[PDB]
Symmetry: D2
Subunit: 199 residues, 4 copies
């Protein structure tokens, strides 16, 4: 719930062609276009980590990961946060948990909920109400990707990595029928790939 919408990727002109970057060859016909390369994600994630310690560094941080199979972004975000802490000459305690949808550990602490993708946003909103119930000092939501979808409730994430168009993306932290885990770029899935690896 802040002004920064993050790195915007418009419907006019999105992403780069597949030939310009290194894609696993078994995914050659399963993707349409690359929206966000792995390294671009890392750079943005590094800035997000500095945004988090800027607004939440005041109290003991509880980093809360959602278990959607996507551990990748949560692990990367935390790595950058730890990188900041090791050069702060104060030893900074931090606890990390996981939620699948005892939380008494959240009382009076800065809670950071980390999400990979936000589409409808009611999965996210549902989690705020449960965490706020345990009376934390503050709750912030980090999201790597926010899709511009008509299924928008109106809820706005605090820390956003990228704002992407309404396409079904896979890669990096997002999978499809447990496929595309070895793909480190965020790319749009094709009709071929959507049918080939269908459940």
């Amino acid at each position: 719930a802040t002004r920064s919408p993050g790195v915007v990727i418009s419907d006019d002109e999105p992403g780069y062609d597949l030939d310009l970057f290194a894609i696993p060859n078994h995914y050659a016909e399963d993707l349409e276009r690359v929206f966000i390369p792995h390294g671009l994600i890392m750079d943005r994630t590094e800035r997000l980590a500095r945004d988090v310690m800027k607004e939440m560094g005041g109290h003991h941080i509880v980093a809360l990961c959602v278990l959607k199979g996507g551990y990748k972004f949560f692990a990367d975000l935390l790595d950058y946060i730890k990188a900041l802490n090791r050069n702060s000459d104060r030893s900074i305690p931090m606890t990390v948990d996981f939620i699948r949808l005892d939380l008494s550990t959240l009382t009076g602490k800065n809670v950071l909920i980390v999400e990979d993708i936000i589409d409808t946003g009611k999965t996210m909103q549902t989690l705020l109400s449960l965490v706020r119930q345990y009376n934390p000092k503050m709750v912030k939501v980090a999201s790597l990707l926010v899709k511009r979808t008509p299924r928008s409730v109106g809820y706005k994430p605090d820390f956003v990595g990228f704002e992407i168009p309404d396409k079904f993306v896979v890669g990096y932290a997002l999978d499809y029928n447990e496929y595309f885990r070895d793909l480190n770029h965020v790319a749009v899935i094709s009709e071929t790939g959507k049918a080939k690896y269908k459940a």
Copy 2:
């Protein structure tokens, strides 16, 4: 077979030989395994896993909560092998709170440290009862301790002396998370960060 064996006669490296956080200067006695050495070993471990379990679909279970870090890096190296194999390979990723889906599947249990070995032996008995095709355990650290039952993981990163270590994936009252290397905690550190 027992992994990289860190003997008892001299225990890793001096603190000033590597870059440790300044606020952990007095809280450590010695560095056993530098971060880079862990990563290079884990890359080989990932190759060993694909060797004995790459036959069928792999369900990788992370034991919560001793440390997520080793699990994250182990799977990163596994995916690296998968994307260069000219073959679309699916993989299940799950976490254990300490589940009947595990029936007839190739299950990989990932632990960051094994001390006595009783936690893992207990976890194994619970998993086998759901009749999995194969269950193997990967452990980053196995300690040489007289308090051990006799359990040995299928995959071992390092065999270390009987000393309380922190860093990389092992914390102490939610401290030392920002420490990359595996180091022995000092008596100062134990008392400074007690609960």
Copy 3:
């Protein structure tokens, strides 16, 4: 292909979207290519290089000076491909000064960090060709769309950028901005701040 094309519509990113050293906050105007984007593109360039001339032994020549980071990273990806090729592939690595008989009959890769007008490379190619090499191709990280270009185009291009003076990654300004890992447009303030 001309590589990744950065148009002049409204390119780059706001400085607030990425991590930038605080002592460079006022000295930069906009970030064109983040460090990670350079690396992902460079990895692909390494693949392209190890296909048009990466058959056997190559001689990789880095132009001095102007940069070194791009040459180091490009070779790191090349060496990463070689160690998965199931074949021991030797490689010559050396640097060239622009004011050498080894190049005779060799497969030469000239690595450059940026190409503006292109006369430096045209001049460089004409001299190398006189030593009669088996083949000489040029890889460049950046190629600027400038009205000043003679018309030279490299065999391999990383990014095509607007006619703006950029610093970072492998490009400096009076030996400053070396610690800046993103490619960014230097501001008027910084340009005057770090003058020679």
Copy 4:
């Protein structure tokens, strides 16, 4: 100039080959891995801050000696540039290459970067040639110092690893331009010496 760096003892040196990831085409060409790639990186990171605390106050001249190697110089520079990001001032730095315009060294902090020091004759030859251009401060960094009686008694200001007297390859150390894709420092085998002979 008396911290010998990470000492690798000689009764049992390094690690077995099967414990780490080694390129398949080098499987028979090596005997023993001394220093894994990641261990080099961690040590190099520490070296980078040793350098910056002594010399790195202001403007330094990073001088690389060309052996066909460059990897260590590039990695050491990367860690140094990583430190200067968290400094609260902009640090200028010049990087150059020399094989044995040197008026540019006068009155500046000169850092000579070496990958391997064996007898040490190369370094003291180079030192005597640099110190006569009157630099404000000239010091030597070396990734590897071999422990050999053939040494002329020269010791570098900054040392990464002190290794036994064996012929090592990998990471910034080639053998007839081979082993460049090997990221670990390993001992070359007899099969390797003949397989990649000139």
